[PDB]
Each structure stands twice: as C-alpha cells, then as structure tokens.
Design a protein around this ligand. Structure first.
Ligand SMILES: Nc1nc2c(ncn2[C@@H]2O[C@H](COP(=O)(O)OP(=O)(O)OP(=O)(O)O)[C@@H](O)[C@H]2O)c(=O)[nH]1
Ligand SMILES: Nc1nc2c(ncn2[C@@H]2O[C@H](COP(=O)(O)OP(=O)(O)OP(=O)(O)O)[C@@H](O)[C@H]2O)c(=O)[nH]1
Ligand SMILES: Nc1nc2c(ncn2[C@@H]2O[C@H](COP(=O)(O)OP(=O)(O)OP(=O)(O)O)[C@@H](O)[C@H]2O)c(=O)[nH]1
Ligand SMILES: Nc1nc2c(ncn2[C@@H]2O[C@H](COP(=O)(O)O)[C@@H](O)[C@H]2O)c(=O)[nH]1
Ligand SMILES: Nc1nc2c(ncn2[C@@H]2O[C@H](COP(=O)(O)O)[C@@H](O)[C@H]2O)c(=O)[nH]1
Ligand SMILES: Nc1nc2c(ncn2[C@@H]2O[C@H](COP(=O)(O)O)[C@@H](O)[C@H]2O)c(=O)[nH]1
Lengths: 460, 460, 460
C-alpha cells in the first residue's frame, strides 16, 4: 500500500480514517473490470458470507453462489444438515432460481409469509411437481387468512423451457403483468423461475462453480474437539472450502488444529482465523493454512473491545496481515465491520483477496431469519453472533461456564423496502468496487492493490 | 306490563328509559330459575344469534346450541354450504366440544393462528385420527414460524373416554398443567375436548336438541325470488327453525311470502320480521307466522334512523308487539340493540319470548371473523350489517341498484382479553337475567313478564 | 299529522325529538316513489338550495337543476351578474354536463386547481372549441407547475355524439382508462361531458325544466329598497321563481313587500319568509305569497338563539305552518337545520313541499367557494351566513349600524373524500327519503304527509 507523502499517523486506521486518491485511468466502463478472486476460493466477486447461523442459510448459499460469492456454513452445524444443504446447493441451476412452491390446500396465511423467503415477489403453485398457478402478495391482501391458495392464485402465467436464452426470457416478461417466468422441464414439471432482474444478473455475474459445474459452498469448523475428524466429514459432505474459525487465532490450540487438518491432505483450501498481526499471519500460514482470516474486535465500542480492550482497527490490520501473507504466497480475508460498499473496496485496496460480510446480509429475504416488523411496520430481521461457537471450551462446570460466558447480542437489521434481496446488496457492493477500480485505473483486483494511493483524513 | 303509578310518559321508551322495581320474592338462588322458553324453538335460554354473516358461523352454531341457544344461519347462504353446516352441528356431542386439530406436519404459523378459533387455549395433535399431543400458545412463543408441530408438542395430556362423568373430568384437571382434557372414542380416536369450565356449563346449561337429540340450528330466508323453494330446501338440509327476514316486514311482498311457506306445511316454526307496530304484528301472525321478530331502527343514531327517520324505541316496540302477539297466540322476538344483559332482561320483562343478539357476539373467538389486533395489541373482531340481503330486490342495472343501496357499515367489536369466548358472554347474560327473576320473584320466563313492575327514569 | 297515543309532550319538537313509525306498505322498491313536488316550483326532488353566497353558485345551479332541484340565487346580487348566470343555466344540456375546459397554453398550476370545480375528475382540452385531449389529476402529478397543458394531455378519449343513448355511453366506458366521455356537437365542437355514474342519474333524476325545456332557476330579493323593480328585474332576467327573504318575516315591511310584488302580476311562484307561527303563515299568504319559508333560529345553540332567545324547534314549526298554509291553498318550505337525509324526510312528513338546504351543500365541488385543505391535508370548504343581507337596513352611519350588526360567522364544511360532489349528497338524501316512503307506504310526497305516523323519543 502506498500513502500520500506525510500521511504517517501515530495511530492505526479504521475504514473511516482512509480515502482512495484517484489515479490516471484507462478503464472506461465498470463492466471492463474483472472482480474474480485469486485466492483459490473460486469466487468471481470478492464477497464471502460469514459463518453465522443468522446469515449463512441454505437459501443464502444458493443465492450468493449463483452471483459469484460463496457462503461458509456455520460451525457445529450437524453433518446431516450440512449434507442436505450441500446436496441442495450442488443441485441448483446456474441461471434459474428456486422459487417458493405452494399447494392449493395451503392457507393464505402461510402463502403470504412464505413469499418473503425469496426476492421474487411471486410463488409458484404446484401439483405433483408441475406449475398450475402463481401467488403474489396482492392476491393475499384483504383475503381470509385461512382461505385456500386455489382461491387467490392466478391461473395464467409465463412459461419457458429451461435452457432458453435469458435475453429471450427478458423480452417475454416485458409486457407480462407478473415479472416472473416459470421455467419448466421438457415433461412440464417445475424447474424454477427467472425474473427480468434475474435475467440481467445472469449476464453480469459469473456463478462460483466447482470442477463439476455446481455452485460452490464452504463450511466452518471450530478448534474444539476432533478438528481433523470434523474437517474430513465436511470435505466428504461436498464442501469446496474449509474455514478453521476461532476468536483468538494466534493460539497454540489453533496451530495444532491447522496442522491436523492440513496433514490429512483433503485437497481443499484452508482458511484460518482470526488474527490481526503479522506474526499471527505467518504462524497460521506455516501451520498449513492457505488463507488467513483477519478481524479481532474491529469496533472500538463493540463487545470484545468493551469487555477486554483487545482488538485492532481493521484497515491497519488488513494492511499488515495482507503484506505478511503476500511474502509467504498466502492470502487474507477481511472479516468484520463491513457496513457499506466502500468498506469492501478499502479492504481490497489494503491487500485482502476476499471480504467476509455477516450482519449486513441478515437484513435480506434470503437470510435464515424470519421477517419481522416493528411498530412502524418496517421490515427487519434479527442478527446475532456465534458467541461460544467461536471460543475454546459436572453440572457445577456447566454454570461455571455460563457465569463468565459471552452474552449473545441481538441487533435489528432493517430491510430496504424497495430492494430487500441479498442480490440487491450484491449489486450495490459490486457497483462501488467496480467504480473504485475505475477511479484507481485498475482492470482487476490485483491491480487495485497495486495502483491505489491511500490517504488519511481527520474527523471532519 | 305494569308500570308505577304516574309513569305515563309522552314518548316511547328505549332500554335506557326504564327500570325494574323489585318485588316480594321467595326464589332463593339463580339456579332455581327456569330460563327455558315457550316459543317452540327449543331454547333453554332466551338467546338467539342473529342471521348475520359476521356472527352466524359454524363454530358459533355448535358452541351456543350446546349451552341452550340457537344460531340462525344468514340468508342467501348456498344450500351446499348450509348442508355442510347443519350436518356438522347435528353430529357434535352435547357435552364434549370440538377441538382445534393439528397435523404433525402443520406449521407453527398455522398452529398459532388456529388456536384462537376456539376458547380452549390448546390444540390437539392428531395422527390418523388419534390424539398424540397438545399445542398451546406458550409452546409456539419464540419458536420459528415455519417449524413443524412435531417440534413443540407436549406429549402428555389428560385422557378420559367419551361419556365420562362431567363432574369427574373436572377432578382430573385439578392440578393439570393445561386446563384441557382430550376425550377419546372407545377405539381411541379423537372424540373432542372438554375443559374445567366446560364441565360446569354442562351441568348448568341444558343443550337445545330436537326430537333426535341433535343440536338445534335455524336458518334465514329472504323475501326475494321464490321463498317457497328456498325455505323448503333449508329444512331438507336439516333445519329446525326458519325465519322470513326483511328490513320492513309490514309490506305486501312479505305477507305473500309467509302465506306461501305456511301452505307448504313443513311443520316448523316460522319467524317473520320486522315490525314495531301492533298492526304489523297481527298481520304477520294471521299470514302464517308463529313468531314475529321485532326491531326496526332501534338506535336513534344508526343507519336506518339517520337515513330515513323511520324506527321506534325497542322497548316500547316489544311491549306493544308482545301484547298483540299473545292475543293471537303468537310470540315475539326482540331483535337488535342488545349490548348489556339488562337489555335481555328488559326485553323479556316487556313480553318477548327470546332475545336476538348479534354484534355483541362478533367480538368472540367463535365468530367467523378473523381475530385482529390494533396498535395496542388488544384483540378485536369487526362486525358488519347484511345491507342488501335484508331489502327488497346487466352492469347498468347493478349500477342503478348500488347507487341508492345501503352501504356496508363496519364497526370494531373488542374481545375481553380474559373472557373472549362466546360462552363467557352466555355466562354474563344468563347470570343477570336469572338475578332479574330473583329480584322480581319469578321462577321462569313466563312468570317474569307477569310479575314485573316497571318504572321510568330521566337522563340522570 | 298523526302522533302515537299519549305522545303529547309539553314542548316543541326538533328533528331529533321525533321518529317515524312504519305502516302497511305495498310500495316494493324505492324507484316506485314519485318525489315530485306539488307547490308549483317544478322540482322533481324536494331539495332546494339556499340563497346564500357560499352555496348558491353558477356551477351549483346547473348541477342541481339537472338532478331535479332548484337553486335560489342570493339577494343583492347585481342584476347583470344574475342574467349571465341565468342564461348559462338556461343554455345547458339536460343530460350532458359542463366539464372543465383548458386551452393548450394553460399552465399546469391553473389546470390542477380548475379540476376540483366539478366532480368529473378530468378536464377537456379544446382548440377553437373542439376537444383534443383530457387532463386528470395523475397527468399533473410531479409535473413542473408552470409547464403547459400540451405537456401532460392524454390525446385519446371516449367520444360520442350529443344525444347518444346514455346507457351505451355507460357501456362504452366499461373498460375505459378514464371514467369520462366527451360529447361532441355535429360540427365536432365540445358539447359537454358525461361520466358513467352520470349516465345512471340521467335515468333516475328528471331535470326540472321550465315551459321551454330549459333548466329551472330561482332568485331571492331583500325587502330593502325597491322590492318591486328588483323582483320585476329578476323576473325579466329569466327567473322561474322568486323568494322575498328576510330574517323576521312576520313584520309590516315584509307584507308591504309581498303586496308590491303581487301587484306586478309577474306570473311566478312567490316564496316568502321567514316565520315559525301559524299567524305569520296566514298573514304572508293573504299578503300575496304562494309559498311560506319557515325557519327562525332552528338550532338551540346558534347565533340567533344565543343572542336574542328568539327561535322555535323546526319540526313543530313546520307542522304548524304547513297545516295553516294547507287550508289557505298554499305550501311551506322547511329552511335551516338540514344535516342528514332524516331531516329531509321528517320535514316532508311534517307537511313541507320542499326542503331548503344551505351549509351542507357548501362542502362540495360545485359550491362557489374554493377547495381548501387543513393541516391533515383533508379537503374542506368554508360556509358563512348572509348576515346583513337578510335584515332590515355617510360613513358615520355605516359604523353606527356596524356596532350592532350581525357578524359573519364562518364554519368548516368537510368534503367526503370519496363523495365530494353535490350529486352524491342528492343521491344520499333521495335514497333516504324514498326509503321513508316505503316504510310509511306512500307512493309520493302528498301521500307521505297523510300516511305518516310520528312518535316522540327521549334523549336516549
Ligand atoms: N410450502 C413450502 N414450505 C417451504 C418453502 N420454503 C421453506 N418452507 C418451509 O419452511 C421451513 C424452513 O424454511 P427455510 O428457512 O427456507 O428452510 P431451511 O432449510 O431452514 O433453509 P435456510 O433457513 O435458508 O437455511 C420448513 O418447514 C419448510 O418446509 C417453500 O417454498 N414452500
Ligand atoms: N388444520 C386445521 N384447519 C382448520 C381447523 N379448523 C378450521 N380449519 C381450516 O380453516 C379454514 C376456515 O376455518 P373456519 O373458518 O373455522 O371454517 P368455516 O367452515 O368457514 O366455519 P365458520 O367460519 O365458523 O362458519 C378451513 O380451510 C378449515 O379447513 C383445525 O382445527 N385444524
Ligand atoms: N380556463 C378555464 N377557466 C375557467 C374554467 N372554469 C372557470 N374558469 C375561470 O375561473 C373563474 C371562476 O370560475 P367559477 O367560480 O366557476 O365562475 P363563476 O361564474 O363565479 O361561477 P360560480 O362560482 O359557480 O358561481 C371564471 O370566471 C373563469 O375565469 C374552465 O373550465 N377553464
Ligand atoms: N465478538 C464476536 N464476534 C463475532 C461473533 N459472531 C461472529 N463474530 C465475528 O464478526 C464477524 C461479522 O461481523 P459483521 O460483518 O457482522 O460486522 C464474523 O465473521 C466473526 O468474525 C460473536 O458472537 N462475537
Ligand atoms: N339497518 C340495518 N339493520 C341490520 C343490518 N344487518 C343486521 N341488522 C339488524 O340488526 C340486528 C342486530 O343488531 P345488534 O344485535 O348487532 O345490535 C339484526 O338481527 C338485524 O335485525 C344492516 O345492514 N342494516
Ligand atoms: N341567523 C342567521 N341565519 C342565516 C344566515 N344566513 C342564512 N341564514 C338562514 O339559515 C338557512 C341555512 O341553514 P343551513 O341549511 O345552513 O342549516 C338559510 O336559508 C337562512 O334561512 C345568517 O347570517 N344568520
């Protein structure tokens, strides 16, 4: 990283303390920029969903991986649920999305609530796997909450076979009353849906796929118990990437957990964290980790900082850790504190290969949380931390632990009433990162870190 | 009716204008009073549910008929929907109630909403018709809205075979955690539900049953179209009582209807309304009606009175109509304006054999309307009038009719958060009427009308 | 007028003190009722617009006359301004209504404000008298306030020649985007406008026409100055009915004003008022008046009552004055206090031939006042009394009279956000009056006066 002359502050820098200075650019348009990562994760956009049960859901894993990101499944998830989630994601179409299915015998109450689990705005009514109707929120307004789906469902809708050019599907939905195209298999069964916005994103985002052309998905594991046995079970379940996650990564028990998983030679990239120092980055890479996750108490007013005073401003943490990992041929993930697309752009300019986002994506339709409304009828969803699931471990001991255990904090994540889907946030994030590369003059992410000139600003 | 000396006002009297003067009494308790009625309806309490779609529902018809009342199904209801309702009510137990049934695959969302369809406070989980668990609102609090009923269900409950002593099923629920007892058939199937309070009301209220021991139920017909074919079809569905209902009963089109239905000879009591005059009362009785329903614009600031000025104070209307109907051997029903149990007591003291209650029963769990909550989270249900379904009967023709047609007014009926069931209102209404007979000195309703001394009061 | 037995109160009755008892009826529908008046006014509905400058406007005169009513122009209006208003009403189509006309050069500011002067919801754009497009509220939303009409006008609209069957115009507007049909003259010029709902009122209301088939219109005149030449000028200006109006009609100066106008032999019905006594009714008709207008401080808390104590309840005043005028071969007008259709029915049942309504019609689009909005953005228009223009009359003398002069009170009249038109109030009033005739059993207004049976009620 190269700073303006004189910008050598006597303190570490957060995402608010820095700014990017424009440089001479030949990149004309934002779509000429290549946002694909080079850390072996397979993501075509530098966005990784955090391994938190409030964010890393099954619907999130399919939706983010189709647009180029990847979702790390939260640790301590039962291996049976992991296999069912991987099998679902690995069986999704790379263009056609999974709609919400309804039976004619379902209630209008359930039909209205299930609609908000996807950003499509319409649910497909099915009978023996074949579409027979559509249900929108306008069809449920003012109707008996225990009327059947057959009482409000639209009988006519746009159908198209799977494999049709999204360009043609985009024109089919031009004058359709419902902006949903029900994609069918040759035998007439339901294969999914595709909207006008969904057809545009197919031509902008490249899905993150494995060697077999299936959507990518990652899984996390704690350093408690048999790390090698849990890691091998996640690899055989179909995981494309493994995250060895703990609160304090610069720990002896973490170094042993990396050497245990790395010695098994599972043929998968190993992410380990978290640390915020150059020494902790090299010790994790030499232990057998390919990627180092950076982020320990990034907020000066958050739980970790207010309880222990331990932490480090994230931008200065990524700068030091990415430079240390570059000398060993490793990579760095910027984890924590991402609130706006400039946080993603500044993390990449600091030297990170990917950006891990958690609580921000909780306020979306695709997050595993239930959609809630406040007194002002504003849509929101709750986000919460993993707490003990990232820390190291008689009935006397059970409450001896809870006496000092970290409390689970809960926050309200408001949804945008016009763009409540996670793909809308992906549009917002990638739009800013692409413009940053244009301001710097970079055609790809490696050039962004190469050609960027940073500066420090005061509180004003 | 006997009034105090000098109480000859130059105006008609509402329920607010009059009071009952206590007399010498030997009736000890309320239970000595016989609230049975003598109008041929078979009601052991003088409570009739009005023929309004906002109140006269299926769950309403079953609940109050067990406690001695009768529900008049709203007119113009399709004969198939009637047939499904009568065959339902006629097939219920005279003590054991119908619970809220849940499948193990139902969602918590539907389970939480289905609970308020009854006053039991708990739902029965069934598999192949056998009770296997219970679901209360405490079991759904804080649970995922789309979790399964298998994830929350209490596996243990109180079991008693159908036909068990209503006093005994009380004893088992003494220290039970949930105040519900699931009754089972001899082969183990779900027979129904009985709570503690349901055991007392089984020993206080006598079920209103026909010759076959099945719960009573009535139906309404409109004077439009062919009344003969409609009224004959309602009794073929299993109706025990028919009412020829219209806004202005003292008209020629009305008189011709009863003379048509009375000549059909179905052997069922015919009720007709409305009139608020002795002339209109006698003309309806001689037309073939056994009971006359009284009530034309009882409120001084309601739709009929403020649009047309036509109406009459309900108390003075029932007094005149009851005296004229008794001379011809007919009886009188007091319809509309009932808000407190003293309105029922004063209508009986005026000479009516039954009291038709409507919007007051809309704010109950058993009403067909959905349970709604305002901004203060207080339960309420909306009531609305029949409008054109009580008046005399091509988009151009539909526009001429709707231009002058009566608007469908809607009002908010709040539920008691502690006593939200319709049986609680039955306990509230009957307790005051029984206490009214004790003050007068009557052992039954025919004695109440003959022994009561009335008086007039001012606004203070 | 017949009252119930015993209903002989020791006080006079307002519209709130009385109610109508329904009797035997053979009138099936409301449409079988003939609302025609028999006082020689020519109105097919018993609705007369008061002679107040806040309601008796040009647009009100045309809109009410087409639906069967008549509008009395306020006194002291310049005779030149009267002739231009009378000629406008006399030159109007008896079915097709006058829309809002816009020049292509008009601003969006003026077009947006001119839309609310009629109840059509759209304005016609004309060039040299021929319609070319429509302007609605949605056309002006979010548009530059000083753009031209040529920037927002919808070029296509529904066209039908003048004289077309109104039911076909109703059918053509079935699925039209704007509920507006532009009627064209043979040469293509703008003949006027006709809406859907307006096509139905053409087949329900009969226009009040004069001997030449033109819309009727009345005018008022004070008793100050030359009552003869003013009444002679108003008659020669085209007035179909004259009103000699004053605050206290039972005075000598009023009788001399009737004798002066009667000696002219203008051949027009003469209305005189106001009085509330039979003696005042006898003296007015014997002076030469054909109709007596009754109303002196009808409200117990209005300006006249609280300042002077002079007044009389309107119902008892109309009953006494109608019976007195009936024996002299005249009729009576109920003036003041009209707030609901109940007041119109009770006034007619009392014996009145027409009901005069004032401040109620001020809260309409057709009233001459400007449409205003309060802090809640709710539509309203202000009403005010004639004050000095209804009483008996240097700058020092002007202030000597102003020291005791009646102040001009101002009240807020709210528009119905869904029924801001005066025709909607006419639909609301006539719907209730027609229902009153069905309850009583009358086929027209003369039968209503005899067949009605009144009763007295208390405050409850
Ligand atoms: N009928 C119907 N039920 C659905 C649908 N999607 C989810 N559900 C039900 O909702 C519950 C779980 O919903 P999801 O949250 O989408 O499922 P999940 O596997 O937990 O996935 P994530 O929360 O995204 O990790 C289960 O009871 C499902 O049966 C749908 O499209 N139709
Ligand atoms: N699973 C389940 N569904 C129910 C239960 N009770 C009612 N429903 C369903 O809820 C819907 C409407 O119920 P109700 O409104 O009580 O039925 P209804 O026949 O209209 O009866 P009323 O409204 O009381 O006249 C129907 O689809 C019923 O099948 C129950 O206990 N369990
Ligand atoms: N361009 C245009 N101007 C209009 C239109 N209607 C009214 N105006 C103008 O606005 C003025 C006031 O309108 P009105 O209040 O309806 O006219 P009025 O003759 O006072 O009639 P009333 O208020 O009904 O007694 C008129 O003198 C015209 O200058 C219209 O349709 N188009
Ligand atoms: N202190 C703390 N950090 C957490 C907890 N759960 C997750 N985290 C960290 O915070 C990150 C998410 O930060 P966010 O993107 O929501 O600002 C996670 O990726 C993880 O590194 C928790 O319970 N406590
Ligand atoms: N005017 C009028 N009366 C109605 C309407 N619907 C029902 N009613 C009458 O009002 C009664 C119910 O009165 P409540 O018990 O709600 O005071 C009904 O039994 C019926 O006689 C309606 O739309 N308009
Ligand atoms: N006291 C009083 N009466 C008025 C005034 N202006 C009009 N009136 C009377 O009130 C009538 C209108 O009554 P409204 O229909 O508004 O209830 C008029 O027809 C007229 O008789 C005024 O300034 N003062």
């Amino acid at each position: 990283v190269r700073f303006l002359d004189g910008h050598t502050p006597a303190y570490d820098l957060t995402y608010n303390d820095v700014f990017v200075v424009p440089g001479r650019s030949d990149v004309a348009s934002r779509f000429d920029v290549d946002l694909s990562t080079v850390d072996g994760s397979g993501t075509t956009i530098p966005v990784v969903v955090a391994n938190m049960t409030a964010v890393a859901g099954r619907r999130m894993a399919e939706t983010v991986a189709r647009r180029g990101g990847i979702v790390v499944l939260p640790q301590d998830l039962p291996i049976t649920a992991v296999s069912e989630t991987v099998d679902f994601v690995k069986s999704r179409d790379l263009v056609v999305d999974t709609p919400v299915t309804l039976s004619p015998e379902d209630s209008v109450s359930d039909a209205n609530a299930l609609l908000h689990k996807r950003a499509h705005g319409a649910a497909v009514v099915v009978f023996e796997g074949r579409p027979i109707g559509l249900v929108t929120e306008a069809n449920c307004a003012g109707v008996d909450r225990f009327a059947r789906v057959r009482d409000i469902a639209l009988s006519d809708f746009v159908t198209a076979p799977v494999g049709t050019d999204p360009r043609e599907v985009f024109d089919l939905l031009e004058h359709a009353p419902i902006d949903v195209a029900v994609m069918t298999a040759p035998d007439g069964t339901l294969a999914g849906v595709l909207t006008r916005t969904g057809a545009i994103r197919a031509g902008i985002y490249t899905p993150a796929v494995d060697a077999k052309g299936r959507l990518r998905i990652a899984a996390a594991v704690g350093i408690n118990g048999d790390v090698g046995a849990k890691a091998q079970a996640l690899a055989e379940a179909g995981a494309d990437l493994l995250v060895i996650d703990t609160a304090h990564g610069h720990q002896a028990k973490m170094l042993d957990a990396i050497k245990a998983v790395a010695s098994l030679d599972l043929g998968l990239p190993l992410v380990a964290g978290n640390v915020v120092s150059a020494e902790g980055t090299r010790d994790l890479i030499e232990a057998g980790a390919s990627i180092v996750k950076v982020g320990v108490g990034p907020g000066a007013m958050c739980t970790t900082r207010m309880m222990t005073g331990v932490g480090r401003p994230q931008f200065s943490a990524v700068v030091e850790c990415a430079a240390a990992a570059r000398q060993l041929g490793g990579h760095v993930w910027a984890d924590g504190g991402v609130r706006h697309p400039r946080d993603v752009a500044l993390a990449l300019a600091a030297g990170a290969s990917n950006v891990m986002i958690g609580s921000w994506f909780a306020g979306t339709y695709e997050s595993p949380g239930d959609l809630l409304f406040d007194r002002d009828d504003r849509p929101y969803k709750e986000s919460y931390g993993m707490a003990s699931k990232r820390a190291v471990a008689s009935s006397f001991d059970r409450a001896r632990k809870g006496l000092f255990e970290e409390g689970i904090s809960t926050s309200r994540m408001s949804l945008d009433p016009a763009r409540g889907g996670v793909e809308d946030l992906l549009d917002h994030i990638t739009s800013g990162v692409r413009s940053t590369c244009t301001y710097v003059g970079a055609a790809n992410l490696p050039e962004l870190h190469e050609k960027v000139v940073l500066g420090v600003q005061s509180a004003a």
